[PDB]
């Protein structure tokens, strides 16, 4: 590799834009850079942020797992839009509709568990009754002190 | 498991499917009968035949190849390509 195929600074003149689009091996009309706010992207082409999962799978690819060709200017986040990672593919249900259904479902189930914790169900019984002063020596009571009498009666 | 496919087997199964099709007569059907020009079928009928091949052999033919398979011999040759027959 040599210098005139390497990235450079932001294209200002249209002939530098044409030289870059010839360098990045794409049409000049499709070639748009990242906007020169000073974030250091340089003259790299702003690809339209499509995940590689979205591509044609039956197409004869150079890189079949990446769904990518030789000499094609890759996406800037190509390490991010691999099929092991972030996807942007279309879904059968809308994005905001998914977020609304998920948030309503999760928050409503949380609220219903809070309602059921507010109002607990039980059995029509008294408490469970244990002998020997509510099992005082079994539950770790000291042998020198003597507790109050816990006496249960027949019924 | 996984029985080997042969061109006799692929040929006989593709013709066995096309002989169970009510727009193709079983007496004019040959191994080189063109769907549009010789058997007189529609492109809709051709898509139904390639989908019947997909139903028959248990895999998918993509559309860039499904738009060009225009005889049973092309079907047998394409399944021979995608299944590596006569090793």
């Amino acid at each position: 590799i040599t210098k005139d195929m390497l990235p450079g600074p932001y294209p200002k003149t249209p002939e530098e834009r044409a030289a870059a689009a010839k360098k990045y091996n794409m049409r000049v009309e499709d070639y748009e850079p990242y906007p020169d706010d000073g974030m250091g992207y340089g003259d790299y082409p702003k690809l339209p942020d499509r995940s590689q999962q979205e591509r044609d799978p039956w197409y004869d690819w150079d890189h079949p797992d990446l769904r990518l060709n030789w000499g094609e200017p890759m996406h800037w986040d190509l390490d991010m839009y691999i099929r092991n990672r972030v996807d942007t593919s279309p879904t059968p249900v809308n994005w905001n509709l998914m977020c609304k259904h998920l948030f309503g479902f999760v928050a409503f189930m949380l609220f219903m568990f809070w309602v059921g914790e507010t109002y607990p169900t039980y059995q029509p019984v008294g408490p469970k009754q244990y002998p020997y002063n509510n099992l005082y020596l079994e539950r770790g009571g000291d042998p020198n002190k003597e507790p109050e009498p816990v006496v249960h009666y027949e019924i | 498991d996984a029985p080997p496919l042969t061109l006799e087997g692929i040929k006989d199964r593709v013709l066995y499917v096309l002989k169970l099709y009510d727009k193709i007569d079983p007496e004019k059907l040959s191994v080189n009968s063109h769907f549009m020009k010789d058997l007189g079928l529609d492109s809709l009928d051709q898509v139904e035949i390639i989908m019947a091949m997909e139903d028959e052999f248990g895999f998918e033919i993509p559309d860039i190849d499904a738009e060009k398979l225009m005889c049973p011999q092309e079907i047998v040759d394409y399944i021979a390509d995608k299944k590596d027959v006569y090793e």
Partner: protein, 99 residues
């Protein structure tokens, strides 16, 4: 429309070459040319010798050290006879029967 005559010719030529390659991936009756190289021994090698090793280990190295193998003491019921002492545990109180 289907293929062109150029595409049908190319697919036929490639198909002939592909079938020749796949047929020539076959094997010879000599191939692979290899270079020139007790009924219950499983229970002896895999069980009995490890039971010997682990019994020697636990008997003379682990239990000879304090608190390494600590065991829950066995469950004593009314009516039992103690082997270390010879003492018979008395039974429970007579039952205020319910049935």
């Amino acid at each position: 429309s289907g293929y062109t005559p150029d595409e049908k010719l190319r697919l036929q030529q490639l198909r002939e070459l592909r079938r020749r390659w796949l047929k020539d991936q076959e094997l010879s009756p000599r191939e692979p040319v290899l270079p020139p190289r007790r009924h219950s021994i499983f229970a002896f090698t895999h069980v009995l010798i490890p039971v010997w090793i682990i019994h020697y280990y636990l008997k003379y190295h682990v239990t000879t050290k304090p608190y390494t193998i600590v065991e829950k003491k066995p469950r004593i019921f009314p009516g039992d006879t103690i082997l270390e002492t010879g003492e018979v545990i008395p039974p429970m109180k007579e039952f205020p029967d319910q049935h």
